[PDB]
Design a protein around this motif. Structure first.
Motif, PDB file in Angstrom:
ATOM      1  N   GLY B 128      49.187  34.636  38.720  1.00  0.00           N
ATOM      2  CA  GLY B 128      48.447  34.282  37.529  1.00  0.00           C
ATOM      3  C   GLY B 128      47.505  35.369  37.055  1.00  0.00           C
ATOM      4  O   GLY B 128      47.226  36.349  37.740  1.00  0.00           O
ATOM      5  N   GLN B 129      47.008  35.185  35.830  1.00  0.00           N
ATOM      6  CA  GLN B 129      46.036  36.116  35.273  1.00  0.00           C
ATOM      7  C   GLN B 129      44.711  36.080  36.011  1.00  0.00           C
ATOM      8  O   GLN B 129      43.924  37.020  35.889  1.00  0.00           O
ATOM      9  N   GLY B 130      44.443  35.018  36.768  1.00  0.00           N
ATOM     10  CA  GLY B 130      43.206  34.947  37.517  1.00  0.00           C
ATOM     11  C   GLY B 130      43.125  35.939  38.651  1.00  0.00           C
ATOM     12  O   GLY B 130      42.023  36.250  39.105  1.00  0.00           O
ATOM     13  N   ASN B 131      44.264  36.444  39.116  1.00  0.00           N
ATOM     14  CA  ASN B 131      44.280  37.435  40.180  1.00  0.00           C
ATOM     15  C   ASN B 131      44.005  38.844  39.687  1.00  0.00           C
ATOM     16  O   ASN B 131      43.835  39.743  40.514  1.00  0.00           O
ATOM     17  N   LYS B 132      43.961  39.058  38.373  1.00  0.00           N
ATOM     18  CA  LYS B 132      43.614  40.346  37.780  1.00  0.00           C
ATOM     19  C   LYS B 132      44.552  41.447  38.268  1.00  0.00           C
ATOM     20  O   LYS B 132      44.145  42.406  38.919  1.00  0.00           O
ATOM     21  N   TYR B 133      45.831  41.293  37.927  1.00  0.00           N
ATOM     22  CA  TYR B 133      46.846  42.218  38.409  1.00  0.00           C
ATOM     23  C   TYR B 133      46.756  43.585  37.757  1.00  0.00           C
ATOM     24  O   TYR B 133      47.546  44.468  38.102  1.00  0.00           O
ATOM     25  N   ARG B 140      52.004  42.472  39.345  1.00  0.00           N
ATOM     26  CA  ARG B 140      52.240  41.102  38.913  1.00  0.00           C
ATOM     27  C   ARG B 140      53.622  40.658  39.372  1.00  0.00           C
ATOM     28  O   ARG B 140      54.530  41.488  39.476  1.00  0.00           O
ATOM     29  N   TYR B 141      53.781  39.363  39.654  1.00  0.00           N
ATOM     30  CA  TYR B 141      54.931  38.796  40.357  1.00  0.00           C
ATOM     31  C   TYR B 141      54.860  39.144  41.837  1.00  0.00           C
ATOM     32  O   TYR B 141      54.557  40.282  42.198  1.00  0.00           O
TER      33      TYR B 141
END
Lengths: 51, 146
Positions: B128-133, B140-141
């Motif tokens: 998710g975007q909350g993990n600040k990829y 991401r993924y």
């Protein structure tokens, strides 16, 4: 994954549903484009100057 | 405290009344048994998994004086299993209490070996975007491989 010594990839279908509202917004501006005006002031000759 | 491969056989032989205060069934029954123990360990290398047994090196004759390499916490389980395997040499049948003891010891042995592998994320699963990829992490993924 390997899947018996191969590399079959996961299917990745794409159904784009986030662009419709963006297109609506862009059409809204392209319908009414707006530009600069140069309003006059309170003076004897400002009308011709603005024109 | 070091545990030879003959202590185990003492345990089998006098757990079913053939060793306690009678003859040691001739030295032949010891060699036959030790071969049985070696083969049973070789088989156990599959289903229960490895438990640290030490095998012979190239030459035959594992011998009863060799160190088994097993912890002392496993001897009852190993002994009961090997008694169950050797009983038919002498044309005997196990009694229900012996079977119950063998099952208890086997369950204790297998409790000390579980893994419960646990599943990982697929690899096409988004993070998710909350993990600040972007800045903190990358990719991401989930990787879901390694």
């Amino acid at each position: 994954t390997k899947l018996d010594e191969q590399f079959e990839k996961y299917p990745k279908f794409e159904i784009n549903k986030v662009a419709t509202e963006l297109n609506r917004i862009i059409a809204e501006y392209r319908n009414n484009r707006i530009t600069v005006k140069f309003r006059p002031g309170d003076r004897e000759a400002s009308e011709e100057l603005a024109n | 405290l070091t545990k030879g491969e003959i202590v185990l056989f003492a345990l089998r032989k006098f757990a079913i009344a053939s060793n306690a205060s009678l003859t040691d069934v001739e030295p032949q029954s010891i060699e036959d048994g030790v071969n049985d123990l070696e083969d049973m360990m070789s088989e156990w290398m599959i289903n229960p998994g490895d438990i640290g047994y030490a095998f012979a090196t190239g030459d035959e004759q594992p011998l009863p004086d060799d160190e088994s390499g097993l912890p002392r916490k496993y001897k009852h389980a190993v002994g009961y299993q090997l008694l169950l395997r050797m009983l038919s040499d002498y044309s005997l049948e196990p009694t229900p209490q012996v079977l119950s003891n063998a099952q208890r010891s086997y369950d204790a042995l297998m409790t000390d070996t579980l893994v419960v592998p646990s599943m990982r994320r697929r690899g096409d699963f988004p993070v998710g975007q909350g993990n600040k990829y972007d800045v903190f992490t990358s990719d991401r993924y989930y990787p879901g491989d390694l």
